[PDB]
């Protein structure tokens, strides 16, 4: 029998991940054995001189589908948000796992405990990085200064806390959840104060496109809800064409036997923005279906043995919303946005 080979980074929040997605499918596969590869590139050190440009640092995410490739690992797990929506050619998402806190959440210093960013003193410093949330929250927030925070979890944690530059900083709540610093949540952000970004909350599992046998065992990962609304939502994102890291934002629900899904876009400040709203009747499917190994992957994602129709259906929906966005020319804010 094929050992089934995970690989991973040695990061705290990679390894949390991975072992999470690997305890499901031991669950799964009582039987099955499964060996863990992380490379560090034998230390810390050579990884810091990449650290001479972060932020977009997906260089981990190449090493990976560059292990995959040469058939090193078999799987590897993913932050869905991390996974671009054009995957490179060989390459597809097999599972996407149930979905967890999708909300941007506010750490706070550990003075104002109690206070929401509403209630914070103005022009009090909010540390993040993303355009995205930042871009939300000057626009909701025009009395609160947003700066750069640069680091992990622990490091932006650790900033925070000693030093008084920054009040809070912007972070996600699957992400805290993960970690174990749940505590740590001070507030849980909704739409109006800030859209999450396409599929946060939800993991993904890469793995090679013509690899019937690792798909077939990763395939009882996939969440059909979860599934739906991270098609809706990437399908919304690719059509918009937006580059890569622009202010696009979304929220998406399932009640009712209807897929709503809600995309924006907004200009680095936030003083223009084309938020809105559509819906389409998509029934969450709980039957597990055999279809065919001849159907092309959705926005990077195979799910084979999940209904189709329903899945086209999310694909419409967020092709439908980024439509209705370019024309009301979302087109010309990300391309101020990608200029700065
Ligand atoms: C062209 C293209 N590339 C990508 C990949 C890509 N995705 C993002 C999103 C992102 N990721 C992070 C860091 C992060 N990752 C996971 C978590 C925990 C929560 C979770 O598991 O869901 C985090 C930390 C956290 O969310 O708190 C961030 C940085 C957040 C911050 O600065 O505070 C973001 C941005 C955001 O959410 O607003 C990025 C951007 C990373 C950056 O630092 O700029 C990238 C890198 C890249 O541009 O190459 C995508 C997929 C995007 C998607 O689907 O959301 C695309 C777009 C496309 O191909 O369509």
Same mark, same amino acid.
């Given at each position: ?12 929040? $990679? ?207 996939? #969440? ?31 009640? #009712? ?36 190994? #001849? ?18 259906? $999310? ?14 020319? $979302? ?10």
């Amino acid at each position: 029998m094929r050992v089934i080979r995970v690989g991973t980074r040695k990061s705290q929040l $990679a390894r949390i991940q991975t072992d999470s997605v690997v305890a499901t499918l031991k669950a799964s596969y009582p039987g099955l054995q499964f060996e863990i590869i992380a490379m560090s590139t034998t230390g810390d050190k050579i990884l810091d001189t990449a650290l001479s440009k972060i932020g977009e640092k997906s260089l981990f995410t190449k090493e990976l589908e560059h292990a995959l490739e040469k058939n090193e690992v078999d799987l590897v797990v993913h932050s869905l948000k991390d996974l671009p929506t054009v995957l490179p050619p060989g390459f597809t998402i097999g599972a996407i796992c149930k979905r967890e806190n999708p909300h941007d959440a506010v750490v706070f210093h550990p003075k104002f405990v109690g206070k929401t960013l509403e209630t914070l003193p103005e022009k009090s410093v909010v540390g993040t990085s993303s355009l995205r949330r930042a871009a939300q929250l000057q626009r909701k927030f025009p009395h609160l200064e947003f700066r750069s925070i640069r680091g992990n979890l622990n490091t932006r944690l650790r900033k925070l806390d000693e030093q008084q530059e920054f009040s809070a900083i912007i972070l996600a709540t699957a992400g805290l959840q993960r970690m174990g610093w749940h505590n740590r949540v001070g507030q849980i952000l909704h739409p109006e104060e800030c859209m999450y970004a396409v599929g946060q909350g939800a993991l993904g599992v890469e793995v090679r496109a013509k690899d019937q046998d690792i798909l077939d065992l990763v395939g009882v990962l996939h #969440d059909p809800e979860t599934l739906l609304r991270c098609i809706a939502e990437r399908a919304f994102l690719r059509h918009l064409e937006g580059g890569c890291s622009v202010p696009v934002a979304v929220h998406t629900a399932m009640k #009712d036997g209807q897929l709503y899904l809600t995309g924006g876009v907004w200009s680095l400040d936030g003083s223009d923005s084309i938020q809105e709203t559509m819906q389409a009747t998509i029934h969450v499917p709980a039957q597990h279906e055999d279809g065919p190994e #001849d159907d092309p992957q959705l926005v990077g994602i195979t799910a084979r043995n999940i209904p189709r129709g329903p899945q086209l259906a $999310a694909q419409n929906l967020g092709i439908s919303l980024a439509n209705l966005l370019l024309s009301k020319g $979302a087109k010309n804010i990300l391309d101020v946005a990608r200029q700065l």
